């Protein structure tokens, strides 16, 4: 989808939990300070539920799709409170934004 639409719409419904713009906080969502290529399951402070901690992926543009589509399914007991996003466009917009949020 669109990178800007991604970041806007992200911020609209995600930033509440995830202030990935600089140096927000964790606090009910880790600030997504470099996902793409970073081995999941190991955050140096707040490292989520064990269900996610145990996941040991590399938050790539596959795992991110499956998660954002169906996060409770992807991880059976994430502390993420999300269940659907819009339709489809957002799963393409968001996952365009974060693909450079990981590098701005
Ligand atoms: C607060 C109620 C949340 C909202 C709204 C969103 N997310 Fe979230 N997210 C939340 C938690 C508590 C966690 C921790 C993981 C766990 O299972 O315990 C997460 C995690 C993520 C991650 C991965 C974290 C990492 O290992 O880096 C991603 C990629 C992520 N969340 C993305 C994301 C997006 C884009 C959101 C809007 C559509 C969003 N989250 C909202 C809590 C919450």
Swiss-Prot record:
A GO BP term, please? cytochrome c-heme linkage
Relay the record's extra comment.
Mules and hinnies are heterozygous, having equal amount of horse and donkey cytochromes c.
Q: Which GO terms describe its molecular function?
A: electron transfer activity; heme binding; identical protein binding; lipid binding; metal ion binding
Name of the protein this chain belongs to: Cytochrome c
Could you tell me which residues carry N6-succinyllysine?
55, 72
* Entry-annotated residues carrying N6-acetyllysine: 72, 99
Name the family.
Belongs to the cytochrome c family.
Which residues does this entry mark as bearing Phosphotyrosine? Answer: 48, 97
Q: Where in the cell is it found?
A: Mitochondrion intermembrane space
The family database entries (Pfam families) matched by this protein are listed as: Cytochrom_C
Species, as recorded: Equus caballus
Principal place of residence: mitochondrion
> Which InterPro entries has this protein been placed in?
Cyt_c-like_dom, Cyt_c-like_dom_sf, Cyt_c_1A/1B
Q: Does the keyword Acetylation apply?
A: yes
Cellular component (GO) terms are: cytochrome complex; cytosol; mitochondrial intermembrane space
Q: Which UniProt keywords apply?
A: Acetylation, Apoptosis, Electron transport, Heme, Iron, Metal-binding, Mitochondrion, Phosphoprotein, Respiratory chain, Transport
Q: Which domain of life is it from?
A: Eukaryota
Q: Which residues carry this modification: N-acetylglycine?
A: 1
* PTM note: Binds 1 heme c group covalently per subunit. Phosphorylation at Tyr-48 and Tyr-97 both reduce by half the turnover in the reaction with cytochrome c oxidase, down-regulating mitochondrial respiration.
Give me the residues that bind heme c, please: 14, 17-18, 80
What function does the entry list? Electron carrier protein. The oxidized form of the cytochrome c heme group can accept an electron from the heme group of the cytochrome c1 subunit of cytochrome reductase. Cytochrome c then transfers this electron to the cytochrome oxidase complex, the final protein carrier in the mitochondrial electron-transport chain.
Q: Gene encoding it?
A: CYCS
């Amino acid at each position: 989808g669109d990178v800007e639409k991604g970041k806007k719409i992200f911020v609209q419904k995600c930033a509440q939990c995830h202030t990935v713009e600089k140096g927000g906080k964790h606090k009910t969502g880790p600030n997504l300070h470099g996902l793409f290529g970073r081995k999941t399951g190991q955050a140096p402070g707040f490292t989520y539920t064990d269900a996610n901690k145990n996941k040991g992926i590399t938050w790539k543009e596959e795992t991110l799709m499956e998660y954002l589509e169906n996060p409770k399914k992807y991880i059976p007991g994430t502390k993420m409170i999300f269940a659907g996003i819009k339709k489809k466009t957002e799963r393409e917009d968001l996952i365009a934004y974060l693909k450079k949020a990981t590098n701005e």
